[PDB]
Amino acid sequence: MNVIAILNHMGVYFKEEPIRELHRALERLNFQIVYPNDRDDLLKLIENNARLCGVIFDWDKYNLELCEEISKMNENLPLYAFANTYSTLDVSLNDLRLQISFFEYALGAAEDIANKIKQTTDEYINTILPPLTKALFKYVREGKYTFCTPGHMGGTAFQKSPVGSLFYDFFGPNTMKSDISISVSELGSLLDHSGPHKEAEQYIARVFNADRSYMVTNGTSTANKIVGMYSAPAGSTILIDRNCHKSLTHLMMMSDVTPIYFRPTRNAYGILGGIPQSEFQHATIAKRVKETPNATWPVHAVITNSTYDGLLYNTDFIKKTLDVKSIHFDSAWVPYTNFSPIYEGKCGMSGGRVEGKVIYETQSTHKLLAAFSQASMIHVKGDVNEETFNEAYMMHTTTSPHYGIVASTETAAAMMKGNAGKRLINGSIERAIKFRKEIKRLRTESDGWFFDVWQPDHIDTTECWPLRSDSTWHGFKNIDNEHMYLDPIKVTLLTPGMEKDGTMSDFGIPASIVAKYLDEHGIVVEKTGPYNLLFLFSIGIDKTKALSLLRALTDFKRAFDLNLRVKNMLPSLYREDPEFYENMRIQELAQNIHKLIVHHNLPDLMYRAFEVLPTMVMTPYAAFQKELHGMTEEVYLDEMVGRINANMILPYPPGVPLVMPGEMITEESRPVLEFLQMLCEIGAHYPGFETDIHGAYRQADGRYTVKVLKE
Amino acid sequence: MNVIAILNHMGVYFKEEPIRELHRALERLNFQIVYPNDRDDLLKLIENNARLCGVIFDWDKYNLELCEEISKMNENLPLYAFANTYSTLDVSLNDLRLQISFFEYALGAAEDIANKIKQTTDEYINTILPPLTKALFKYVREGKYTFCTPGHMGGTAFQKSPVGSLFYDFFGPNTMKSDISISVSELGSLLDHSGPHKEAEQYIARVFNADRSYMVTNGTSTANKIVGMYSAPAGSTILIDRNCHKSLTHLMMMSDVTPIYFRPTRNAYGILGGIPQSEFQHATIAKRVKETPNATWPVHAVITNSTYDGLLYNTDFIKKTLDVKSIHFDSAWVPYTNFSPIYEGKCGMSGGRVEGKVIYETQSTHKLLAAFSQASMIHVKGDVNEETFNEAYMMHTTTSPHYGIVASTETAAAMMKGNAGKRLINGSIERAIKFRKEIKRLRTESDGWFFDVWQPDHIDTTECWPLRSDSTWHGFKNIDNEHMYLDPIKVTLLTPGMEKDGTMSDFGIPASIVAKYLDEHGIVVEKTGPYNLLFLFSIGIDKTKALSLLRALTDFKRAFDLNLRVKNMLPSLYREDPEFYENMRIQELAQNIHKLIVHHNLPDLMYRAFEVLPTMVMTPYAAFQKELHGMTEEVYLDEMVGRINANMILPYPPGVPLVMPGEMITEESRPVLEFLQMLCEIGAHYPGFETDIHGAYRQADGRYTVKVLKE
Amino acid sequence: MNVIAILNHMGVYFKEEPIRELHRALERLNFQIVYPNDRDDLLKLIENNARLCGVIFDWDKYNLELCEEISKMNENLPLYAFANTYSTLDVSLNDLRLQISFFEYALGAAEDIANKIKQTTDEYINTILPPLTKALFKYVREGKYTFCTPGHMGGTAFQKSPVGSLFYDFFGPNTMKSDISISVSELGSLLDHSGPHKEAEQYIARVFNADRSYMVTNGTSTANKIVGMYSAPAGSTIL
Ligand SMILES: *Cc1c(COP(=O)(O)O)cnc(C)c1O
Ligand SMILES: *Cc1c(COP(=O)(O)O)cnc(C)c1O
Numbered sequence A, B: 001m002n003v004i005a006i007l008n009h010m011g012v013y014f015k016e017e018p019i020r021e022l023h024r025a026l027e028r029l030n031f032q033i034v035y036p037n038d039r040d041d042l043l044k045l046i047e048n049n050a051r052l053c054g055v056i057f058d059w060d061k062y063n064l065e066l067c068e069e070i071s072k073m074n075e076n077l078p079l080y081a082f083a084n085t086y087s088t089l090d091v092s093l094n095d096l097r098l099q100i101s102f103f104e105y106a107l108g109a110a111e112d113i114a115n116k117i118k119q120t121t122d123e124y125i126n127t128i129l130p131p132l133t134k135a136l137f138k139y140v141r142e143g144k145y146t147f148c149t150p151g152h153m154g155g156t157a158f159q160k161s162p163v164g165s166l167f168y169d170f171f172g173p174n175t176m177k178s179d180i181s182i183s184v185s186e187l188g189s190l191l192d193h194s195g196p197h198k199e200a201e202q203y204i205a206r207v208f209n210a211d212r213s214y215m216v217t218n219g220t221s222t223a224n225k226i227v228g229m230y231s232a233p234a235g236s237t238i239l240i241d242r243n244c245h246k247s248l249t250h251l252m253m254m255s256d257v258t259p260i261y262f263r264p265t266r267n268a269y270g271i272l273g274g275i276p277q278s279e280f281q282h283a284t285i286a287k288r289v290k291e292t293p294n295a296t297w298p299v300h301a302v303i304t305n306s307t308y309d310g311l312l313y314n315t316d317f318i319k320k321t322l323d324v325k326s327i328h329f330d331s332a333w334v335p336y337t338n339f340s341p342i343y344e345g346k347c348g349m350s351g352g353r354v355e356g357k358v359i360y361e362t363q364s365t366h367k368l369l370a371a372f373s374q375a376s377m378i379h380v381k382g383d384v385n386e387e388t389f390n391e392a393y394m395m396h397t398t399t400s401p402h403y404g405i406v407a408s409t410e411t412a413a414a415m416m417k418g419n420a421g422k423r424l425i426n427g428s429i430e431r432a433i434k435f436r437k438e439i440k441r442l443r444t445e446s447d448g449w450f451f452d453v454w455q456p457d458h459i460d461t462t463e464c465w466p467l468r469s470d471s472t473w474h475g476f477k478n479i480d481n482e483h484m485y486l487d488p489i490k491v492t493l494l495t496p497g498m499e500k501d502g503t504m505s506d507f508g509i510p511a512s513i514v515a516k517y518l519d520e521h522g523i524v525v526e527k528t529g530p531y532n533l534l535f536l537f538s539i540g541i542d543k544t545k546a547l548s549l550l551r552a553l554t555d556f557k558r559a560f561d562l563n564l565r566v567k568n569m570l571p572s573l574y575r576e577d578p579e580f581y582e583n584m585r586i587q588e589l590a591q592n593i594h595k596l597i598v599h600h601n602l603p604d605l606m607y608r609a610f611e612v613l614p615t616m617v618m619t620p621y622a623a624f625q626k627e628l629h630g631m632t633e634e635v636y637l638d639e640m641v642g643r644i645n646a647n648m649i650l651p652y653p654p655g656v657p658l659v660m661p662g663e664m665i666t667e668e669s670r671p672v673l674e675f676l677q678m679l680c681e682i683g684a685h686y687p688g689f690e691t692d693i694h695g696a697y698r699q700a701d702g703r704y705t706v707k708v709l710k711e
Numbered sequence C: 001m002n003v004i005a006i007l008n009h010m011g012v013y014f015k016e017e018p019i020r021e022l023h024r025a026l027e028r029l030n031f032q033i034v035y036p037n038d039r040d041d042l043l044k045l046i047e048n049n050a051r052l053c054g055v056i057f058d059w060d061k062y063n064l065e066l067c068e069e070i071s072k073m074n075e076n077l078p079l080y081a082f083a084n085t086y087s088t089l090d091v092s093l094n095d096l097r098l099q100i101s102f103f104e105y106a107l108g109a110a111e112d113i114a115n116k117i118k119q120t121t122d123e124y125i126n127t128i129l130p131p132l133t134k135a136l137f138k139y140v141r142e143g144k145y146t147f148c149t150p151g152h153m154g155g156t157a158f159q160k161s162p163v164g165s166l167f168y169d170f171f172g173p174n175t176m177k178s179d180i181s182i183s184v185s186e187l188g189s190l191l192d193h194s195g196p197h198k199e200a201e202q203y204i205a206r207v208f209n210a211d212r213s214y215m216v217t218n219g220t221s222t223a224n225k226i227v228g229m230y231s232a233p234a235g236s237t238i239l
């Protein structure tokens, strides 16, 4: 932050001479001097260059063309405008947040002007930063408190060991000095909720529109277990979603509760939809209570909004139909549904406090924002006990938190405040919609097959495309209108190979081959398998990272139409088995895999398997108790009908659980077992595409083994 | 790491000319050149300067005086010794780990020598570093895999926001690039325990002498709950220590178990001793099972070794008398009991595998070592199930671990391996023993009172001082011999004010006033209150931080003997209440507080209160169930006899729990209630020394309120 | 105030090399470096030279010949003494007012040492000066309050008149900026006897051994008329 802009050359000498004298004075305090050209030149030095804090221009030249466009980007940006004798303001310059510092054209006084710019720049730094981060940066340059934790104390022990000097010189001197615990008086403690930590929690909830919010320092996987243990006593009933996370499954194994799984919607490509509106009724929930042994009235509900693919729900209908006093929303993929008018009424924070209910959200911080890993939040909207919810937060958070992540956790809430942060959320949406139009433009004009974006036929708008009932792009039968939304920054590329009715075709390329082709250039697909390609277009994807993805997609069509070899296209796959992948081309491998999907019938053995649910004998908490006593055994995959599993089956593809720990496969869940045996055959012929199931151990013959319980 | 040493000036020209030519060649690749004088000069450039990797000296001048002292410090340190024509080795140079690189004195070949030094230096970096850290540093300069988590992607989003540029320019560009998740193929995942993470768990367990060790990324407070949820089913019996931690209390409130509290020893100064040998008997444990309703055979035991003050126990006697198959040792203060011969047989890892038992330890990493915060380990010594214990670890660690802390967790185990790490553990002990002798030297020679170290009269040794039965320095009656140890790096300053029998005196200064006086110069007291001052002498405490503590202690005697004012000595205390602390001196405040301790009788109302235990009605897990249902109420402190509390009482001073959540104060625990009412009176007369109890809330009249359960 | 003294030479290289690295780091923040000779050389750099604030010497060489003579001349004078491994204090160093800052001989950390000396020097300035004078110097560097008396406002009107530029350039920029009236909130007023002016009256009386003392701004000739008009009514008798 040391860029000073000097716009507009008057041509006279009594105005350019003070500029030349100031040029030699600002460089003595480390400041970069730039000279833009016209009005459009200064506008490009703010959106692209974020390290600018000084704009020098003539006030009697552009008093209305610069005070309006700059105010729409940054409000507290200092403006070192130079006025004259006959200078005045304008009536249209009253409702604009600006910081204009006037000066004169006096010779010899250039030294006093340089001291005022440095003092004004320090005021801008001490304003846009939160008080928690301000106390961290001040303690590095001035704090000298000895005998504190940790033992390194800014890297003192690293300067005495030969191996410790390499780890300290990589990050930097200012990196280890900010690693302090609760051994500081002028910073308070995180568990005490006092001092700078008290004002930090009120600053995040005010920007994100909330009443009280904490700072989880162990990722979202930990924040879901703290809230789940607040409104679920031993022996109650919870309403967890079927499309849950690995951490959400362990929550059912740590508390003696009786969960009730929902019935989400799904298509044939593998993209899971959402929970229908009929499941939130009173006659639907109460019907499953009597059918499930040992189950009372549900007091907590876990809703995955959005899912792993990115599909927003309708919170305006759940907060009125679902009769749960503690409704939870797993907002681990949408930490931005507030800073844009196309996201109002789509989350729990949008709106107001529900009478007699409370909304919990675990907005991830390190997922789709800009902060260190292992960072999460707990958004509470309602009237809860402060002395009770505080004890549950200390059950998973240590007494010495890492302030390096805490400073970045609150930073994400400050980077989005104001018009400077709205240009990053709306900017990523405009870059995502532009990428969606570049696919349809290069599809009809191309000569052959081309990738397709899972989007409606009409994308001539900047909002969330609703999933209506008279469309064929989504392919969700019996879908509810005004309930399923689409995330514009969640572009899902649909590779050719299937039709629009859900059947198979004759010519197509699976998404597993494209996933490895993008890895050679440094692109890893977020979700691949059947015929989908999920990508993340958050604030970290600029115009360079977005255009680099389109160029790699055009190279795959050129290499496939010319029929190239595997060695001259996929060097990483050739090193796995050079003998088998010798005389093989890109067209021979793409056609042999497509025939195996039609032969084994993948879309049918996957849709019917995920629809039915195995018979849940006991609660997931009771299954973990038998494992600690040693009553577990390893059986074959073909010999397991009528047994209780011990772990959760997570087959890849897709990425959703199959059998929960504590269920039994009877005659109702017959297609469930057929889905596991089909992946063991298709993933054994060609190397590289082996079967990936988190729970199936590979032996020395080919047959996988599962972990069940003793009879 | 770029320091090259050139020792011994022969005086000739055919040997000094290649040195001058090499001086201009090594500077082109960023290397600092130093020229030591005699033999003692080179020895000071290694212990103090850890960034050295090149030693150039004549082989035919000091072939035995340098190859022996350097080998005792660093083994893999390269030695760029220059040999001659008539050069040979020595018989005494066979059992020494060195790396000697021979060269010649050729003109013009100085460029080829610089390439060999840079290549040898790169081999030294790629050897002393663990494979997990090596893969993290290499991924920064080569790995460019985009479209992955976290969202910042090396700090890309920070370059677009004005406030984000100030946070990216603080830690450094190489800091954000090293923040990656499990979205990397060549680094594996932490939950999968494969790849670099698989070899990292074996490298730590080998140095720390263990079979399997993990890396907890949420501090030690979280790792204690992982072991507690493995050998303690719902309805069993655990043996938790009375001197537990805040996280250990929440473990009893999350699992339906029946804990049995021990009876640790204690004196009058507030320093808690340890568990006697009689509590580990079979007739003592089985007697408390019948007296406690709903209690079976104990299957798990939690032993706090060491405590908060630093007192090692006797693991050689516990592992034979205590009949518990799952014995836990809370080693949250001794992460170094395997690098010195004066610590053998004092921890659970020392020795061998116990037949039919298993030892669990939670060594703290960010306490007395050198690593980032929120880092812990789980040491397992026994025969446990791998597929069962792994599920308990994933119930508290997120799926995307922060590799910045994981790389530093294994670094702490790598910085101590070899003789280079033994000089830091034994070096901190030598600096601690030297500090203990400087107190007794400045006590008799001084003219007046002086601080005293809680140590025996004979400290003329370098080992752990045992607590015998014929000594008066410890003041623990009915103590067991060869069971209580002393940590030399845990110096506890005993301020004058009490006698050696446990009564009170006439002249003394409390430790609370000294605690605030040390904060002015930059010294934070770890534990204070009655008449004790606990400090931490880790590896980070060098000779500068050690000598700075003695100077501040001598300044307190000078300011007190001359009778100075509070405003001219304690500026922080004067700003709290300038009106009351106006006409007050340092002698008037030190004498008024000492009379309040004798009047209210603190040592008697604290020793008898901690001895007796309240009547535990229900288990701590059952007390948390009534809090979620809204059956709590706030009552006065004077009206609570016969009620069940909801929170844990943690009064300061000292720092140990008083009443556990789920206990009742009857007629047996009468002194327990008197201890809470005594602190409310002594901490209300003079500002700054208010009553600090983690459980009692301050109202608007003076009387504190507690949180109990409804009848 | 920017003179740093480095006394004695141990002759070794692991102690003189950190001195050479610190020599190039202290000059970047405007600090003069002097190299005294023997013990009598450092004593002449304190009584004669008053702009000195840093004394660097070996702790294991003159631990009693320097900590006694310097204490007899200045109490809050910082002492940047470098200690070693086998270093300790003396029993005759308990009743002496000194400010000893310990360091090491580590290479590469010369930049961090320069930041500790600059902050220690700033703490020395903010301690020996009274709070009234300290608040006046900070108001000049940090103070953009407009529409206040007097009319010059740090010398603003002097930059417009040709004759006024000769009077403003004679004293200095920091001279006219320190001439402020009671138009400042964080400095209080002299007639109100509150804020910094309240603590200044109690500080002067404590130095000159008194209970209360004011500050007359019109010489002694005016102070004699204030006391005379307090204990001499109309028609009384004075001696
Ligand atoms: C990725 C994810 C998590 C894990 O996020 P972390 O911050 O790494 O713990 C938890 N829940 C959901 C729904 C996720 O998608
Ligand atoms: C300090 C301490 C802890 C907490 O350590 P962290 O690594 O910060 O989690 C836990 N137990 C004991 C006994 C402690 O002293």
Ligand SMILES: *Cc1c(COP(=O)(O)O)cnc(C)c1O
Pocket: C218, C219, C220, C221, C222
């Ligand atoms: C010199 C003198 C004065 C005048 O002093 P000023 O401070 O200039 O007013 C007054 N009284 C006596 C006795 C003097 O000697």
